[PDB]
Amino acid sequence: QPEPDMITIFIGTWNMGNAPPPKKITSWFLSKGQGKTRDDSADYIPHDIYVIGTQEDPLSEKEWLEILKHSLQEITSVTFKTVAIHTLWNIRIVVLAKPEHENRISHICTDNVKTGIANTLGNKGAVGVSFMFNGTSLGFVNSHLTSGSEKKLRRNQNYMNILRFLALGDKKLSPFNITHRFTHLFWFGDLNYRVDLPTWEAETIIQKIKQQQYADLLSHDQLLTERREQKVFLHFEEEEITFAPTYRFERLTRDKYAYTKQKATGMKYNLPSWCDRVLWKSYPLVHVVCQSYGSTSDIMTSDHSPVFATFEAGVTSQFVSKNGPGTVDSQGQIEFLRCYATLKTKSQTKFYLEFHSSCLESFVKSQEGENEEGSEGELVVKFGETLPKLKPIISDPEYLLDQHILISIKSSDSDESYGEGCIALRLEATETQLPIYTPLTHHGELTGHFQGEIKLQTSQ
Ligand SMILES: CC(C)(CO)NC(=O)c1cccc(Cl)c1
């Protein structure tokens, strides 16, 4: 039975509005309704992994697992295994997988982060799951961020707290937050970003939605504008939105947006918005293709419509050679030449690098680099040809070319990371000096750049 090189992943996000679901929700798992939908000819084909994020979920874990498992069984005739389930208040993530994947899945982690302080600590935050699928690390984050058209900054703050404090993936990757720990990271939820147009334009917005004319609305979507200004979700992707706003509907129909201020809304307008979103971030040069991104039309128990997204995702096998794992393979080496970090920091400490990768027995500390002044005020840390030669566990190019090196630049004074990034070993050539590059982030904010050249030796 051959190990897969590709899997399909279903991501669902639904704010249930504290109401039980209707008896049939199969349209969600089938990617049917509005937007980029799945072909009818695929309806009996199960996804490998289903990740279900809910918000304002009134159900017990047991109640929701029974609905989900019985829904997928009806669609696919397959009885899914429960990988993980985690609930913070009314925020829930469920991971289900086809039975053939049970013994490919290991290192399951779950966590939550509560956002806000005092007043604003009460019901918003995130849940997450991570695990290994053969040689591939997968992370999933379901977040319910701060509500309200006038709180986009609060939402960006919630995002930064979630990505700093959510403890998923390999704890040995200690300088790295969840935005560097996974081959593929999926971040979805009721992110609560609004269409930022005047209240007086509500009926105009509804008109535009009825004509399926979204361009002038999406140009005012707070998540798209905040992302474009690098305020939030830096280095994340999102598929083009081609479905109507998923909030705020009158319940029991989809014919009406309920946007007017009411006691129940704290006298706030809820102009039609794309609250409910799916984004991802994969390591460089790993296959990831969005095959669907849309909303259901036929599930009307909530004031939100469910959103679906499906992905093809590249995965690798567990790899065993004569040598590694358990030793190095002297026919392999990674050399970094003429490397320098450019940092936005105004500080003056020395810096060194750490290299982390599952292709190494353990992480490698470099010598301190040489600080120079950049021509436009910047700190440039020069490593030259001084960086340690990295000794991979396996030299076979079918393994090594699929790997990644995580880089942290750390202060000699504090040992705190000032920047994190990732270099793919999927090179155009081996035994050849080739340019490499990664932006560097810390707490998911741009702090600089790492660039230079790499020379990769494999057994071929
Ligand atoms: C018992 C739970 C629900 C805990 O998260 N699931 C597992 O432990 C598990 C482990 C390996 C593979 C798979 Cl499919 C599930």
Swiss-Prot record:
Tissues/organs with expression: Specifically expressed in immune and hematopoietic cells. Expressed in bone marrow and blood cells. Levels vary considerably within this compartment. Present in at least 74% of immature CD34+ cells, whereas within the more mature population of CD33+ cells, it is present in only 10% of cells. Present in the majority of T-cells, while it is present in a minority of B-cells (at protein level).
Superkingdom of the organism of origin: Eukaryota
Reported impact of residue 288 to E: In one patient with acute myeloid leukemya; somatic mutation
Post-translational modification: Tyrosine phosphorylated by the members of the SRC family after exposure to a diverse array of extracellular stimuli such as cytokines, growth factors, antibodies, chemokines, integrin ligands and hypertonic and oxidative stress. Phosphorylated upon IgG receptor FCGR2B-binding.
Record's subcellular location: Cytoplasm; Cell membrane; Membrane raft; Cytoplasm, Cytoskeleton
Function: Phosphatidylinositol (PtdIns) phosphatase that specifically hydrolyzes the 5-phosphate of phosphatidylinositol-3,4,5-trisphosphate (PtdIns(3,4,5)P3) to produce PtdIns(3,4)P2, thereby negatively regulating the PI3K (phosphoinositide 3-kinase) pathways. Able also to hydrolyzes the 5-phosphate of phosphatidylinositol-4,5-bisphosphate (PtdIns(4,5)P3) and inositol 1,3,4,5-tetrakisphosphate. Acts as a negative regulator of B-cell antigen receptor signaling.
Note on domains (UniProt): The SH2 domain interacts with tyrosine phosphorylated forms of proteins such as SHC1 or PTPN11/SHP-2. It competes with that of GRB2 for binding to phosphorylated SHC1 to inhibit the Ras pathway. It is also required for tyrosine phosphorylation. The NPXY sequence motif found in many tyrosine-phosphorylated proteins is required for the specific binding of the PID domain.
Subunit structure: Interacts with tyrosine phosphorylated form of SHC1. Interacts with tyrosine phosphorylated form of DOK1. Interacts with tyrosine phosphorylated form of DOK3. Interacts with tyrosine phosphorylated form of SLAMF1/CD150. Interacts with PTPN11 in response to IL-3. Interacts with receptor EPOR. Interacts with receptors MS4A2/FCER1B and FCER1G. Interacts with receptors FCGR2B and FCGR3. Interacts with receptor FCGR2A, leading to regulate gene expression during the phagocytic process. Interacts with GRB2. Interacts with PLCG1. Interacts with tyrosine kinases SRC and TEC. Interacts with c-Met/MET.
Family statement: Belongs to the inositol 1,4,5-trisphosphate 5-phosphatase family.
Protein name: Phosphatidylinositol 3,4,5-trisphosphate 5-phosphatase 1
Source organism: Homo sapiens (Human)
